Design a protein around this ligand. Structure first.
Ligand SMILES: [Mg+2]
Ligand SMILES: [Mg+2]
Lengths: 223, 224
């Protein structure tokens, strides 16, 4: 049966600063996983951000390019954020692979998603370890005919999918081995950043039901 | 260190008696379904008892299409690996009625023009040494009035089972010199005129590989 190979299997990529799984249909990451180091800012300022680079490990049929973003009116939103990974130049450089990138409404990337990333880093003062899983959603909506539809834009030659929403799952270890899960969803839209961040909390089941994903699966019974 | 709680998202291969498939939990749908066709031997395969569609308890319930998702939708439960391919054993036919092998199909298409494509596929086992078939959904973008391109598909049921916009069917045909051919078909998920000849839905395989995220040619070239 499988004598002519399998047409598609899971595309994990490990980089210096994150691991991701890649969806070649949407030309985007399914999820991106990272740890946030405490702050320390003093060995590891000082960092010289890179150009964005398409990912040669992805087949060119299925690979976002800088031309796909240029003139789209979306920014290149890095899912594993570059400011999480100033602890190493290679660590920071790897966040500028476009496989780490989704089309993001610039106001979201600039203001309220930025605030979410800075709050996530701040929890390293408070917890034994902080891990973060970031990814896209494509959430359906009801229309006038009573039916539900997924509708998302695609941009560029390569039809790079524009997510309707983004999730960020904070995986927070407090000191007992105890894992706390904090789950945020924002729309791919202008979002007022003075709205407190707890208003974008959603139950983790919601993200898991909609995204296809099952987070922290080694945790057989959650707290 | 990142793996210490394990990874969010796993490859979902299922091997059944009559096909291998890969499963997308986000669309609640197979990415592709891969089968090897038998010669048409109705006498030799003999009688089969009835099967109806049942949900795939091997898929997590968050992501598992059920019969209730289809009831009322106006779509047929369209099997990707077709039941009539696999009368050679009862297990083989029964496994095609897992809803993980099923996509929402416009009932006219399931009954006339996709059925004709399936029957034509089985007829090629009269000629070729082997016929491999890989079937799957597509979700193709369209341009709208604003000049921009969107993907739009319906989801049905409590479980949001995605309705493909199109279907693809790739045939791999062996003849006797070590000859290997690929042939690719796309139809819309729509009432298709069942008197249009099937050759008109031939598309080059690159167009399917580009749109689907899948790769067929490099595997097959590698094995020669
Ligand atoms: Mg960014
Ligand atoms: Mg069918």
């Amino acid at each position: 049966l499988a004598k002519y190979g399998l047409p598609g299997v899971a595309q994990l990529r490990s980089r210096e600063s994150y691991v991701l799984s890649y969806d070649p249909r949407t030309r985007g990451a399914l999820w991106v996983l990272e740890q946030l180091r405490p702050e320390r800012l003093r060995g590891d300022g000082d960092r010289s951000a890179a150009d964005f680079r398409e990912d040669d490990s992805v087949h060119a049929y299925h690979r976002a390019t800088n031309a796909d973003y240029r003139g789209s009116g979306f920014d290149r939103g890095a899912l594993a954020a570059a400011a999480n990974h100033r602890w190493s130049q290679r660590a920071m450089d790897d966040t500028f692979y476009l496989s780490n990138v989704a089309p993001q409404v610039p106001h979201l990337n600039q203001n309220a998603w930025n605030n979410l990333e800075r709050y996530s880093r701040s929890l390293t003062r408070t917890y034994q370890n902080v891990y973060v899983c970031t990814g896209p959603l494509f959430l359906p909506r009801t229309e006038a005919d009573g039916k539900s539809y997924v509708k998302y834009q695609v941009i560029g030659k390569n039809h790079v999918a524009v997510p309707t929403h983004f999730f960020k799952v904070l995986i927070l270890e407090a000191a007992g081995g105890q894992i706390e899960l904090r789950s945020y969803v924002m729309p791919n839209a202008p979002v007022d950043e003075t709205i407190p961040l707890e208003r974008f909390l959603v139950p983790i089941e919601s993200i898991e039901r909609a995204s296809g994903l099952l987070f922290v699966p080694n945790i057989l019974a959650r707290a």
